[PDB]
Amino acid sequence: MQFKVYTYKRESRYRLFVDVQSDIIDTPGRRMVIPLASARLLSDKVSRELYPVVHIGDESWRMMTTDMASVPVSVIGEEVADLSHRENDIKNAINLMFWGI
Amino acid sequence: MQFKVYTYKRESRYRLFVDVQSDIIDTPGRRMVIPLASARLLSDKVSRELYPVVHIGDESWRMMTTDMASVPVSVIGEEVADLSHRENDIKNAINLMFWGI
Ligand SMILES: [Cl-]
Ligand SMILES: [Cl-]
Numbered sequence: 001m002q003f004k005v006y007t008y009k010r011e012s013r014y015r016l017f018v019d020v021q022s023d024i025i026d027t028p029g030r031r032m033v034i035p036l037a038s039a040r041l042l043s044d045k046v047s048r049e050l051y052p053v054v055h056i057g058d059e060s061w062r063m064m065t066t067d068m069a070s071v072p073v074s075v076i077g078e079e080v081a082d083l084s085h086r087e088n089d090i091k092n093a094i095n096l097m098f099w100g101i
Numbered sequence: 102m103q104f105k106v107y108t109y110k111r112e113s114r115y116r117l118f119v120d121v122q123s124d125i126i127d128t129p130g131r132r133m134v135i136p137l138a139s140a141r142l143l144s145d146k147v148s149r150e151l152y153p154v155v156h157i158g159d160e161s162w163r164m165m166t167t168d169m170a171s172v173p174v175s176v177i178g179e180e181v182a183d184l185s186h187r188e189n190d191i192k193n194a195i196n197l198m199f200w201g202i
């Protein structure tokens with residue numbers, strides 16, 4: 001479901017992903033998502049508009065907008081959080097990636 | 102470059118992909134793309150608004166919007182066509198996937 005965050009059942013580069021696909025867009029067995037990388041060692045020079053910083057599990061994460069990809073529902077693990085409250089920054093980052101400023 | 106179509110140097114599910122990332126968005130060594138599937142046997146029931154039909158190599162192709170993913174520049178092969186003339190349908194499909202109608 002859109003803006004919900006889940007873990008991967010099968011190991012991936014990153015450990016969490018936020019579903020960014022519309023809830024009215026039906027793609028049987030799959031969902032478009034954006035991975036979240038730990039912002040623990042990641043550089044601050046990175047555009048926050050394109051790569052929003054979110055907070056889950058008492059830590060900071062970077063939404064890896066440019067690593068967007070679809071995942072089969074078979075790999076969708078437990079839901080760990082809801083990022084719907086960050087819809088504005090998430091929307092802006094996605095739009096920026098395709099259409100610029 | 103945005104809206105340009107290329108072949109994969111390494112075999113993938115599909116054989117062509119259209120670069121949909123903004124030309125002002127810099128992601129060293131990678132680009133966000135959408136694969137194109139042959140519309141030869143593919144069903145007509147599929148939403149054309151979400152999955153635009155384009156023409157390359159004297160054949161019809163379906164832009165697999167929901168299979169969007171980034172590819173490393175190392176796998177980007179020869180450029181075969183330019184779909185910039187279909188910017189309107191491409192833009193609408195991408196936007197629809199995330200934000201609905
Ligand atoms: Cl990480
Ligand atoms: Cl947050």
Ligand SMILES: [Cl-]
Nearest residue numbers: 029030073076
């Ligand atoms: Cl599901």
Ligand SMILES: [Cl-]
Nearest residue numbers: 115116138139
């Ligand atoms: Cl094909």
Ligand SMILES: [Cl-]
Nearest residue numbers: 154155156187
């Ligand atoms: Cl066309």
Ligand SMILES: [Cl-]
Nearest residue numbers: 130131174177
């Ligand atoms: Cl390049």
